[PDB]
Design a protein around this ligand. Structure first.
Ligand SMILES: [Mg+2]
Length: 665
DNA sequence: TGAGGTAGTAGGTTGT
RNA sequence: CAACCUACUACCUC
């Protein structure tokens, strides 16, 4: 429990809502064709937009801060694809209270609309959504870069206004598709139809004749889409989604959409540009003078991290020794021309295993994957002589090969860590992270936490995989007393939402893992989800925990939405806790401007401080980080990576991989 | 594939 | 319409 500190957030307080904004006008709606089922809301919101003025939806009909008489109370609209005649009917005004969150919800919405709408008419200003740009930063040959900020406006509990502000840049081009080539520019990886709004991943060009299943130049004009311009026919792109077959379209009806290559704010300058814009907006909108909102920060007890002895970053366990070594064999695979183990790597590993008192063996695989099945027999044999993981020296592999090889070894129970081939002793940070990764893949506890924490078990949950279906998975850190890191077999699912039965099952695996290292159940576990928790996702798992008499806390850990945190005076410390609302706090562990982790206590009865403590500390357990800690707790960072990697290479291989070998780092 | 991060550019899922 | 998440790319950092 370290020392206080005062900080201000990237929010500001503005003028109290006025007697007229506290009593919104109410209006019912009437659509014809009469509304559907789940089509009502995505549309009742779109009618607030069409109606005009500052109006947002409020129940079955919308609310408005503008009088009905200055609204388009009747008009026409088209939705999913139908002409819907509408008519707004007035039904008096109904006051709202900031204290009553349900209603304060609406005020904040009107407030967000007021924000845009007022911005919409500031001459000399581009409003792309709730974000605004008000300074040019640089230019080129039709390629201009706008400065500005993204912002939100909501209502406080004291019936006052709140404005969140954060600097941003924009990239904008003028020249058409072929008009961008008139500049001599290179092939924009992406583009977007002016006529439509679709973004095509431009593939290449072609001398192919336009007049030459469909007739290009001809049918293109059939939609009367030949007017306005034409230029060089050029590209025959492909749907970014189904990105194979070629579906060509005229390069007169595409607008070039530029990117980074085809400018980084120092926090000191961001805290400046933030206050500037804040003032500016309150001034230009009659919202008043911006009072920077400030909150109490807290410095958090630095973690005591333990190799064989105390250590400050995982890499140092390389010279001190490991929190827990064991007899370990490690094989080598060379996909370049060379034969033996680079001596400095040989030395480096001995020096570390010496220091630990544990015994090492350094095998070599004399085989190439080119051999086919005979190569798998080579693996079968090394795994037989007790190799636990392999290092692979190789020039940069391609994704498709890289995956195939990784997946191959895992089929023989062998985790692999690639180290790319042009390699020199001085590239020390490279190969030491490669070494840590190899040892983690071998099953070794590199470092752990000395300390006492509320929960002896910490499990992270994530879901992911590019494809049509996802995986839901869990990693975990066993025993408060440092950690033992484990992964569990993920399970395939339709969406991001992990199924309840599945959450509990993965959870139960973590529990059982704990039971088998300490002959007892854990008294309390710490549950970590990445991002918003899908409502009720942990329903069963929590009830199940209860009936087993295990204490719990669920925390939602978000990487986005933490906003910004600035020092009132001085420099900010690495480990800062910052309670916000109720049940929600930030955590900052940072040559740019940092993003705080936003954390939400979704369940359980534990001091936000206590949780922030563990969490921040788990940040240090990640064994392949090396010379830098991940922003997220080791057990969550792991679940994130495992789920990604089972995504990349499929679940069928992991049958025979020891759950203590972190193969995915 | 060494790894942590932020920052531009795309975009998908959950949810009322 | 919010709240999160993803992928590229470019930079930094050890
Ligand atoms: Mg790795």
């Amino acid at each position: 429990h370290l020392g206080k500190t005062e900080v201000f957030l990237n929010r500001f307080a503005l003028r109290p809502l006025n007697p007229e904004e506290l009593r919104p006008w109410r209006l019912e709606v009437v659509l014809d064709p009469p509304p559907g089922r789940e089509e009502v809301y995505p549309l009742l919101a779109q009618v607030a937009r069409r109606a005009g003025g500052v109006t947002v939806r409020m129940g079955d009909g919308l609310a408005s801060w503008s009088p009905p008489e200055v609204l388009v109370l009747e008009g026409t609209l088209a939705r999913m694809g139908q002409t819907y005649a509408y008519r707004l009917y007035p039904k008096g005004r109904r006051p709202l209270d900031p204290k009553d969150p349900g209603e304060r919800s609406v005020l904040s919405a009107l407030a967000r609309r007021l924000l845009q709408e007022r911005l919409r008419r500031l001459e000399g200003v581009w409003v792309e959504g709730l974000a605004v740009y008000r300074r040019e930063h640089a230019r080129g040959p039709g390629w201009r870069v706008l400065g500005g900020a993204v912002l939100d406006l909501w209502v406080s509990d004291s019936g006052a206004f709140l404005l969140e502000v954060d600097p941003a840049y924009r990239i904008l081009c003028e020249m058409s598709l072929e008009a961008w080539l008139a500049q001599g520019h290179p092939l924009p990886k992406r583009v977007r139809n002016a006529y439509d709004r679709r973004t095509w991943e431009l593939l290449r060009l072609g001398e192919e004749d336009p007049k030459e299943g469909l007739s290009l130049l001809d049918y293109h004009a059939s939609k009367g889409r030949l007017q306005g311009r034409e230029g060089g026919r050029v590209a025959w792109v492909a749907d970014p989604k189904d990105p194979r077959k070629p579906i060509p379209h005229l390069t007169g009806l595409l607008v070039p959409v530029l990117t980074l290559e085809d400018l980084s704010l120092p926090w000191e300058e961001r805290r400046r540009r933030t206050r500037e814009i804040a003032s500016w907006i309150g001034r230009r909108l009659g919202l008043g003078t911006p009072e920077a909102v400030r909150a109490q920060a807290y410095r958090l007890s630095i973690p005591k991290l333990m190799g064989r002895r105390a250590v400050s970053k995982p890499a140092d366990a390389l010279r001190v020794g490991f929190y827990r070594a064991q007899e370990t064999a490690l094989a080598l695979l060379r996909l370049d021309g060379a034969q033996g183990w680079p001596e400095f790597l040989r030395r480096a590993l001995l020096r570390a295993f010496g220091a630990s008192g544990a015994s090492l063996r350094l095998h070599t695989l004399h085989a190439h994957p080119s051999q086919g099945l005979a190569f798998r027999e080579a693996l079968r044999k090394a795994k037989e002589e007790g190799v636990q993981a392999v290092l692979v020296l190789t020039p940069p592999m391609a994704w498709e090969d890289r995956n195939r090889l990784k997946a191959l070894l895992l089929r023989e129970g062998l985790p692999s860590q690639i180290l790319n081939v042009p390699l020199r002793e001085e590239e020390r940070h490279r190969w030491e992270n490669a070494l840590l990764g190899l040892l983690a893949k071998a099953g070794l506890q590199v470092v752990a936490l000395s300390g006492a924490y509320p929960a002896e078990l910490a499990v992270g949950f994530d879901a992911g995989g590019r494809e049509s279906f996802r995986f839901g998975g869990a990693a975990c850190a066993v025993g408060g007393d440092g950690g033992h890191l484990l992964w569990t077999l993920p399970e395939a699912q339709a969406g991001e939402r992990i199924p309840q039965e599945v959450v509990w099952d993965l959870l139960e695996e973590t529990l059982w893992a704990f039971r088998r290292k300490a002959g007892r159940l854990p008294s309390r576990v710490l549950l970590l989800r990445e991002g918003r928790v899908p409502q009720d996702e942990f329903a069963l798992a929590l009830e199940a925990l209860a009936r087993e008499g295990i204490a719990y806390d669920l925390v939602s850990v978000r990487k986005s939405g933490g906003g910004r945190v600035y020092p009132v005076q001085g420099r900010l410390a690495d480990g800062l806790y910052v309670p916000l609302e109720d049940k929600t706090f930030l955590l900052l562990t940072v040559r740019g401007t940092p993003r705080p982790l936003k954390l939400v206590h979704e369940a359980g009865d534990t001091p936000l401080e206590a949780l922030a403590h563990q969490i921040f500390h788990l940040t240090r357990l990640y064994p392949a980080s090396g010379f830098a800690f991940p922003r997220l707790p080791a057990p969550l960072h792991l679940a994130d990576r495992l789920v990604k990697e089972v995504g990349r290479l499929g679940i069928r291989h992991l049958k025979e991989v020891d759950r203590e070998k972190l193969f995915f780092v």
